[PDB]
Amino acid sequence: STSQVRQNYHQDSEAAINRQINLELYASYVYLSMSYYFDRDDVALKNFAKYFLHQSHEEHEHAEKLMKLQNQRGGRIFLQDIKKPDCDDWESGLNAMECALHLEKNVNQSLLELHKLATDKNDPHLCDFIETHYLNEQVKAIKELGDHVTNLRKMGAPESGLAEYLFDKHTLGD
Amino acid sequence: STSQVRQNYHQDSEAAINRQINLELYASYVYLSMSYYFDRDDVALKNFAKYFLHQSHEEHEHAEKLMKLQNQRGGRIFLQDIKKPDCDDWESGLNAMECALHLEKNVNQSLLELHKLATDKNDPHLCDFIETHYLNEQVKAIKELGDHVTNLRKMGAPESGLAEYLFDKHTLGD
Amino acid sequence: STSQVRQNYHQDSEAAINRQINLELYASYVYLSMSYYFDRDDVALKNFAKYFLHQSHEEHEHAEKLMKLQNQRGGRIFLQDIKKPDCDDWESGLNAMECALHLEKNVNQSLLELHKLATDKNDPHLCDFIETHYLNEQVKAIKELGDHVTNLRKMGAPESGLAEYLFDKHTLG
Amino acid sequence: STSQVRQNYHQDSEAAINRQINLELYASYVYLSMSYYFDRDDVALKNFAKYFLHQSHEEHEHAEKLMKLQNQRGGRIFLQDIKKPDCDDWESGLNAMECALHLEKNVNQSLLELHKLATDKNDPHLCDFIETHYLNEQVKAIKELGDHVTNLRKMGAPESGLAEYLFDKHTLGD
Amino acid sequence: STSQVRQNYHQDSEAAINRQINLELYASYVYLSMSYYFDRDDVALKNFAKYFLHQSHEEHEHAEKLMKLQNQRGGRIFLQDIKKPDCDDWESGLNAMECALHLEKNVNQSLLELHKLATDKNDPHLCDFIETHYLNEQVKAIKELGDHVTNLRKMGAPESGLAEYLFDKHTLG
Amino acid sequence: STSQVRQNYHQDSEAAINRQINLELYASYVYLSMSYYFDRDDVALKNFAKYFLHQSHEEHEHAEKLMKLQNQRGGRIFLQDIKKPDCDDWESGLNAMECALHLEKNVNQSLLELHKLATDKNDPHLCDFIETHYLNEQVKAIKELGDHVTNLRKMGAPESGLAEYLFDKHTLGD
Ligand code: NA
Ligand code: NA
Ligand code: NA
Ligand code: NA
Ligand code: NA
Ligand code: NA
Ligand code: NA
């Protein structure tokens, strides 16, 4: 049965929105895993943990806003399993940052495919939603992760534990 | 003659902007009619009246912003008659909400056709104007009107006058 | 059936109130047209536009108050088409002021005929309503528009664009 | 290798903590599903949605605190898939409240089994952790959900939509 | 090699961003020239100078935002010579306003071509960037410059120095 | 014709002021290039970028003050092309600081030649203008750039990326 509010909202866009919801929830799960990995007593980088917890919360907000959009357009939310992250151990702050960069680029690629689908279906409201709330957020996150990776590599990470300690203090601390 | 400021502004877009101006003015007229229908002593739903007056003011602001855009791009405003609404009596709060939902969906359809036209003419400024100031406003208005219709139906409207009274108090009051 | 609140409210008064509502809505439409005429890039008199937008809001408030009165007395609102203004181009600030003076005098004439009808129907509440909320408002608007036309004419409008610019700055600003 | 901080922390307690983490994340997922079910335009009970979103946040805080405890005792976090909820459609406010009551009782049962395990392993710190941060939280949640279900049934839910509307307004609103 | 952050960013978009940076810097240079032209003792219209200095600052901020975007997407900034303006003497306030209108329309045309390129490359982030930070800014600047030119012409500029004096005082002040 | 305000303002001084205007604009351009070089994701030294942006603004203020002086004395501003900087890539923070030191010494040499010309033309107002607003600014900028180069060299730059990171944090940050 069609929703009383549905208008110019293709079924493919609805399915793709559900997939994007699942993907953003998965990204939040990955970031939560990273955060509490750096909370371990044998890693002990509290600011890495805080940074990744903040990224987890940001991805969760992305997912919730996608669910709200789904309801706004008359689509129907269908949730799926949130897969566990690929790693239980993230090795180092540099490796965690590189994995976060890869994850953000994958989420951005999915969002670009979603925008392409919305464009092909002539859905300007969905295109504008994606542009306003996701595309530049992903661009900024990717640029910041690239900066962090560059600085960590230049400081001597991951071989230099002093490098990761000082980066945790001076960049991710304040 | 051509305006000294006109640039990448097609004649068809100008005419469509004038048509949209007339349509938004008509929608404001319809909402004003509804509002003062609920002000009648034999209807007496003060919060319904306030809600529809607010919707009238919003539609009028849409029309004024369209006129400002027309002047910004070097087009020329051509006003037409504002036709009276199709009904003098709106029967009930639920029926008024359903008519408002239908009207907002018609205005949204006209806005989507206008955006398709702006896209065909390669007018990205007009596309951005429509996306930023109208499309999501329509989506939110339609979602809210659907919520109102749903609650009124589930409460027992329009047969239950108690339902419309309580909805006027608890939803449209605060 | 008759409204439970209707008392001493003649049918002719009700019809005339509906006509006056349509007229006030039309006057607001005309003022809106003028306002956005002076917003054009080839006219560009911001304060003329602001003045006429304010007049448009005043006329719309008059119409809403008439609708409220109609409901207060037990009458029934019947809306009609709001006709487009007679002009799309108002030529100049002086000509727009003269057209506004003419429009306000027509609205005042309609209001005086409505007061005459209310008097013939022995409806003192309606007479007092018109006196309190419309008649002096019209007298003041007409006096102000006459002052504006006089100043614009004496300054050299409409031939002198400098005159309309300075009037836009110093009077309407 | 064994953590430098591990002391009197049994492996079974560690595995059970991981299981409890997964269960609390699952409960948060269920509550989020419920919340955005009530955000649908054909349901439109915003206070039900807010209440269930708050319960989702509560379960997520429970999960994060369990992860922090795991790291505190020298255990190692191992995350698993977060299974999708059993329902996509929650039918009614009363049925959603009943499902939430069932869910809270299941989480409480798991917490009680975990406390029994901690008692058998002579881990008084874990017993105190569970008592202080979870058991009474569950008792309060279960009591409140029972109150809500009782009021909804006595008002005439789920047949009376007026009942769910008024309960959304007067109980979950203020 | 390709930046670790580069994603869906075409080489043509990068080159066009560099060209747009050069163009915005050039527009800032032209506005600075105009501003300090009106600072001359034989012109002496301080508010024209203030207006054009503000426009120079706006165009340079546009250029800095383009450079920030270039770095955000993984492109590489390549700066070029900033050509001197076509005029050292701008003759009058009206002629300066007309030249500014022409310049803003040229910048807007380049921005529209850049947006069309971004559309052809299916780069929605760049399209949104251009729409959000440039297109409406250009539309507003062009509308305002048109208003200024219209008022200056109607007041009697450029033959009437009194017109430019009064416009400097009452509009740009 | 001669300006009504011109007095004791030689033709050579006017031409030299125009040349100095071009040179200060060129220096601002060079500093802007450096600043946005350090904004690159593969360099990522935020405080170096801020420092060089500030130096760019300082040089632009110098140029604007020269233009104001030109108009004050009755001279006529003649602008020229602002040449692009000699480098697109500044290699390192230490090399950028050394290039900035070289640039500031070149600007100072031009200012000293300009003061020599003003002295030969018996223009005490121009001498005082140069002394008050430019010469000591150049001396202070050169001293500061020398301090920065010295510290960067002593810390181990440019081979040690940790050195440039820590200098960015502790010197250019506060
Ligand atoms: Na857009
Ligand atoms: Na992100
Ligand atoms: Na609307
Ligand atoms: Na009036
Ligand atoms: Na709970
Ligand atoms: Na501009
Ligand atoms: Na300097």
Author numbering:
A (entry chain G), B (entry chain L), D (entry chain E), F (entry chain K): 4 to 177
C (entry chain D), E (entry chain B): 4 to 176
Q: Which statements did the authors publish about this structure?
A:
As an iron storage and release self-assembling protein cage, wild-type Ftn (wt-Ftn) comprises 24 FTH1 subunits with 12 C2 axes20. With the ultimate objective to create a biocatalysis platform that could be expressed in vivo, we report the rational design of an artificial human ferritin heavy chain (FTH1)-based metalloprotein to achieve histidine-specific aza-Michael addition with α,β-unsaturated chemical moieties. Utilizing the large area the C2 interfaces cover altogether, mutated FTH1 subunits were designed to assemble only upon divalent copper binding at the C2 interfaces hosting their histidine mutations. To still allow these sites and/or structurally induced nearby residues to chelate Cu(II) for catalyzing histidine modifications while allowing the ferritin cage to reserve its self-assembling property, instead of modifying all of the above-mentioned four copper-chelating histidines, we attempted to replace only one (R63) or two (R63/E67), which are noncopper-chelating, with histidine analogs 1–3 (4-thiazolyl-l-alanine, 1; 2-(5-bromothienyl)-l-alanine (BtA), 2; 3-methyl-l-histidine (MeH), 3), separately, via genetic code expansion.
In the crystal structure of Ftn-1x-3 without Fe(II) or Cu(II) content, additive bending hexaethylene glycol in the C2 interface binds to MeH63 and generates another potential metal binding pocket, along with the 59SHEE63 MeHEHA67E sequence that can be found in the Ftn-L56H/R63H/E67H mutant. In a comparison to the ICP-MS data and structural models of Ftn-1x-3 and Ftn-2x-3, the E67MeH mutation displays dual roles in aromatic ring stacking and metal chelating in controlling Fe(II) and Cu(II) binding. Upon CuCl2 treatment, Cu(II) contents in the two selected variants notably increased compared with wt-Ftn, whereas there were no significant changes to their Fe(II) contents. Conversion rates (CVRs) carried out by Ftn-1x-3 and Ftn-2x-2 with 2 equiv of DEEM were 20% and 33%, respectively, making the latter more desirable for further characterization.
